[PDB]
Design a protein around this ligand. Structure first.
Ligand SMILES: O=c1[nH]c2cc(C(F)(F)F)c(N3CCOCC3)cc2n(CP(=O)(O)O)c1=O
Ligand SMILES: Oc1nc2ccc(-c3c(Cl)cccc3OC(F)(F)F)cc2[nH]1
Ligand SMILES: CCCCCCCCCCCCCC
Ligand SMILES: CCCCCCCCCCCCCC
Ligand SMILES: CCCCCCCCCCCCCC
Ligand SMILES: CCCCCCCCCCCCCC
Ligand SMILES: CCCCCCCCCCCC
Ligand SMILES: CCCCCCCCCCCC
Ligand SMILES: CCCCCCCCCCCC
Ligand SMILES: CCCCCCCCCCCC
Ligand SMILES: CCCCCCCCCC
Ligand SMILES: CCCCCCCCCC
Ligand SMILES: CCCCCCCCC
Ligand SMILES: CCCCCCCC
Ligand SMILES: CCCCCCCC
Ligand SMILES: CCCCCCCC
Ligand SMILES: CCCCCCC
Ligand SMILES: CCCCCCC
Lengths: 77, 130, 162, 55, 124, 24, 147, 51
């Protein structure tokens, strides 16, 4: 249902969103390089996230990534 | 307004919670009162209906787009009435269609004989640009 | 600071919503005749200038609401009722409870304002490319400014109690 | 020949079944009405609970 | 158009900007030590250098799967310099020159992604 | 479009983080 | 674990709407109910989405009527005939009960369902969406349908 | 939620499995109802000659 060019774009966007969330949570909630990968993985698979970002600049990444995985999964189904 | 009558539901956390509820992803916070829980449940029902309807409409769009058939044979062109087919005004094609005793071509001839728009073109280049 | 940003907002939201429902320049359809709320004034309709009233005549409950536009008006009635509630901060002061009565009307008008559009769009459609004029976008500002005035009126009530 | 062949409409051309209309608010307003009604009911029950707790 | 390499060049612009702040915060830490607690100035430097080297490792990995080997050559010598520091783990004048070049290199290559991305999007 | 929205959100979040870091 | 009459309702509502539940049942006899309700709501939402996708994909519009003996019982669509002709004379002297009921309905009907010419009849048919029906000859009916 | 690293790998792979299964089940059930609704019984002689 999804072209091979999209699957390669999802993985790098998943890691790209994860590394940005770690950088946002660094200038200032732990949200390390490990917890950010877990939160982004729990958000992409429509599962319940363990924790939510506290800062506004971290909440923007969460809400935007939530809209991303919603459109992608709805388009895949 | 509801969850602040006089908790952790300010004006910044309420937007975050409602955004997480609309995306069906959930948050760590939840309404503690009764009317707040009513608001949350109504918003959950609304966003669930919206997401299900959007997914269904996208699936229907994709299925309708994939189930298409271009006009290839003359039998498909005779049955399909959305595209009007015409020939030269005075040529061998019109004379052949006027004397074609075939059910596939007879219906086409009767369709091209009565038509409000121009179904006969004098110059072949005019028909090409048309 | 916030005590003055509410009275100026009530007169900037009621006086701005009453204009959006007054001028009939909400929808632009096709001759190109601009539409409105209670009556549409035609243009390029075989006449230079013509402006006639629309005739709308269990689905009958939606037609009367579209004709008798009460929801886009009820929001303006609540904006003036809440605009005088915050005006009661000087006279009969030290009450610490009349400000909460304004935070309810400031948001109850926003619920009746978004509804006034749902009954207007569902009845509009019920090819022809139609757009929304500048007069229709004014009503949208009557809902955004109705929520900022609904968060600034209740926040003062919380600070007064604390 | 004289009744069905000399017809003005065709069943194949009429049954296009392509380019379905995008969903509009004409049939989705049923959920927005319920959302607004639930918000109003929640505000009302919150006000009633506050009035009961004050008394 | 829309290619996988065009999307890789878009994520770099958002990520390379974060690498700019690291080399800028580096010259500020070296400027404070030049004027003159000393542990907080160097321990924080050890905490900031690790993400800067790991983020650049993605730049050499994203373009590897994007078939854009013309850009990879502009980032391989940068990754080779990280191997020298990772292997061995006055000095003020040497490290100062070793940091001003980072700000210039992370900026000149930053304008490449701002232009090489346009060379693929509008070129449909 | 969703990829553009993702990139724009990441850029806006980086800008907001810069602003909040320079606020102190 | 409290799980009162309120918290249980909240948890069930959060589980039905695919949202993240606040708490999970501690005992096994509560975890069983939780998992069963999760499976139930998953199946229900999947079936609802599948049916809504099947609806917008293909349409099957059926006629509101199928015969004359069916419209004589619903009496929701006002059907009309010719003023003076074969149809009126046939419906006048009818011994069968169905056509007799049709005639006694068409007699006392406001407004007048009778039409002078067939052109006005087909015009009223094309005008009225689903509240009119004309009773003409099968040949002329097929000819008008094919026009 | 799994706190360790390899424990998170188990949850991540299981999450990918249940996502594909549920999405495939919903997509297949939609195809069943659509094909069943898009049926046409033989009515005319032209339909019987073709079928
Ligand atoms: O002997 C004949 N030789 C023809 C040769 C050609 C071609 F070679 F293809 F140009 C064409 N065309 C094909 C399509 O329309 C434009 C020109 C028609 C011919 N006709 C029919 P006419 O031109 O109506 O007399 C003849 O009778
Ligand atoms: O009295 C009024 N209240 C209003 C609230 C919102 C809008 C609106 C805007 Cl601001 C932009 C785009 C679409 C809009 O209306 C929608 F229904 F969403 F299509 C118009 C309004 N008019
Ligand atoms: C979260 C709970 C939502 C409940 C919604 C109830 C809606 C009832 C609508 C009844 C319509 C009846 C039509 C005949
Ligand atoms: C059939 C047409 C009915 C029109 C009713 C209009 C009612 C307007 C009420 C305005 C109240 C202003 C105070
Ligand atoms: C978008 C980036 C803006 C950067 C602004 C930097 C301002 C620095 C002010 C203090 C400089 C001190 C130099 C010793
Ligand atoms: C939770 C992460 C799951 C990752 C699954 C990766 C599967 C890769 C399959 C590659 C197939 C290549 C076929 C040409
Ligand atoms: C603070 C975050 C507000 C929400 C921003 C992202 C919303 C989802 C994407 C919307 C794109 C139009
Ligand atoms: C309906 C009769 C009164 C019309 C008044 C029109 C006023 C237009 C003001 C425009 C301000 C931008
Ligand atoms: C057909 C008559 C229309 C009259 C419209 C009057 C609108 C008054 C609005 C008052 C708002 C406070
Ligand atoms: C302890 C609970 C075990 C799971 C029981 C319910 C599982 C979902 C329904 C399965 C029906 C076959
Ligand atoms: C634009 C200023 C207000 C106009 C309306 C005044 C009241 C009219 C009542 C019929
Ligand atoms: C595309 C030609 C160069 C390939 C280099 C692979 C390492
Ligand atoms: C959901 C995870 C998809 C991974 C795809 C990896 C390339 C085929
Ligand atoms: C906060 C710790 C970051 C560690 C990064 C490791 C990358 C492989
Ligand atoms: C105290 C400031 C509140 C701002 C709320 C804005 C809602 C759109
Ligand atoms: C544990 C308290 C139960 C209260 C039940 C009330 C039902 C209306
Ligand atoms: C106007 C109310 C502002 C609340 C801010 C909470 C973080
Ligand atoms: C720290 C920013 C708070 C914003 C509150 C209103 C959105």
């Amino acid at each position: 249902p999804l072209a091979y060019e999209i699957w390669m774009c999802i993985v790098f966007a998943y890691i790209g969103v994860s590394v940005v969330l770690f950088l946002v949570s660094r200038f200032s909630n732990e949200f390390g390089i490990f917890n950010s990968l877990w939160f982004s993985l729990g958000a992409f698979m429509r599962q319940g996230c363990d924790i939510s970002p506290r800062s506004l600049s971290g909440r923007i990444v969460g809400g935007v990534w939530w809209f991303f995985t919603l459109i992608i999964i709805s388009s895949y189904t | 307004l509801v969850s602040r009558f006089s908790n952790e539901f300010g004006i910044f956390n309420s937007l975050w919670f409602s955004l997480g509820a609309f995306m069906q992803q959930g948050c760590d916070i939840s309404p503690r009162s009764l009317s707040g829980r009513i608001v949350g449940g109504v918003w959950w029902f609304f966003t669930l209906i919206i997401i299900s309807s959007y997914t269904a409409n996208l699936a229907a769009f994709l299925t309708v787009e994939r189930m298409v058939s271009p006009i290839e044979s003359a039998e498909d062109l005779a049955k399909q009435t959305e595209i009007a087919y015409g020939t030269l005004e005075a040529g061998s094609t019109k004379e052949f269609f006027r004397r074609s005793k075939i059910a596939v071509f007879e219906k086409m001839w009767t369709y091209m004989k009565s038509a409000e728009p121009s179904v006969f073109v004098r110059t072949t280049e005019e028909g090409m640009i048309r | 600071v916030q005590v003055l940003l509410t009275t100026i907002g009530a007169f900037s939201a009621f006086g701005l919503m009453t204009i959006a429902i007054s001028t009939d320049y909400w929808l632009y359809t096709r001759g190109l005749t601009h539409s409105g709320l209670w009556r549409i004034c035609c243009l390029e309709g075989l006449k230079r200038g013509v402006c006639v009233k629309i005739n709308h005549f269990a689905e009958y409950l939606l037609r009367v609401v579209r004709a008798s536009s009460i929801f886009p008006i009820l929001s303006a009635i609540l904006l003036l009722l809440g605009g005088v509630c915050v005006a009661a901060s000087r006279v009969y002061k030290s009450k610490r409870n009349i400000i909460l009565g304004a935070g309810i009307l400031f948001v109850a008008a926003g619920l009746s304002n978004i509804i006034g559009v749902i009954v207007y769009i569902s009845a509009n459609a019920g090819k022809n490319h139609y757009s929304y004029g500048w007069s229709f976008y004014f009503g949208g500002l009557s809902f955004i400014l109705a929520e900022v005035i609904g968060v600034l009126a209740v926040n003062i009530y919380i600070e007064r109690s604390r | 020949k004289w009744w069905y062949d000399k017809g003005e409409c065709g069943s194949g051309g009429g049954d296009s079944k392509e380019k379905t209309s995008a969903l509009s608010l004409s049939n989705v307003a049923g959920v927005f009405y319920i959302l607004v009604g639930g918000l109003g009911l929640a505000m009302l029950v919150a006000l009633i609970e506050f009035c009961y707790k004050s008394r | 158009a829309f290619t996988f390499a065009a999307f890789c060049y878009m994520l770099t612009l958002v990520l390379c900007a974060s690498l700019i702040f690291f080399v800028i915060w580096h010259i500020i830490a070296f400027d404070e030590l030049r004027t003159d607690n000393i542990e907080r100035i160097c321990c924080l430097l050890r905490k900031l250098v690790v993400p800067e080297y790991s983020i650049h490792g993605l730049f050499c990995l994203m373009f590897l799967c994007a078939a854009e080997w013309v850009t990879l050559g502009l980032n391989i010598p940068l990754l080779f310099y990280h191997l020298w520091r990772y292997f061995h783990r006055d000095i003020l004048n040497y490290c100062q020159k070793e940091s001003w070049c980072k700000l210039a290199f992370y900026l000149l290559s930053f304008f490449y992604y701002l232009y090489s991305m346009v060379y693929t999007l509008v070129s449909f | 479009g969703v990829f553009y929205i993702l990139i724009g959100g990441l850029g806006l979040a980086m800008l907001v983080a810069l602003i909040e870091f320079c606020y102190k | 674990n409290e799980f009162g009459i309120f918290n249980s309702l909240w948890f069930s509502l959060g589980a039905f709407m695919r949202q993240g539940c606040d708490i999970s049942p501690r005992s096994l006899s509560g975890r069983i109910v939780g998992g069963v309700w999760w499976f139930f709501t998953l199946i229900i939402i999947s079936s609802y989405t599948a049916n809504l996708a099947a609806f917008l994909t293909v349409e099957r519009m059926v006629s509101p009527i199928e015969s004359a003996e069916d419209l004589s019982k619903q009496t929701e669509i006002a059907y009309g005939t010719l003023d003076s002709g074969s149809t009126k004379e046939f419906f006048r002297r009818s011994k069968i009960a169905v056509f007799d009921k049709m005639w006694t309905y068409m007699r006392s009907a406001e407004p007048s369902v009778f039409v002078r010419t067939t052109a006005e009849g087909v015009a009223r048919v094309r005008k009225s969406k689903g509240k009119y029906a004309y009773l003409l000859e099968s040949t002329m009916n097929e000819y008008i349908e094919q026009r």
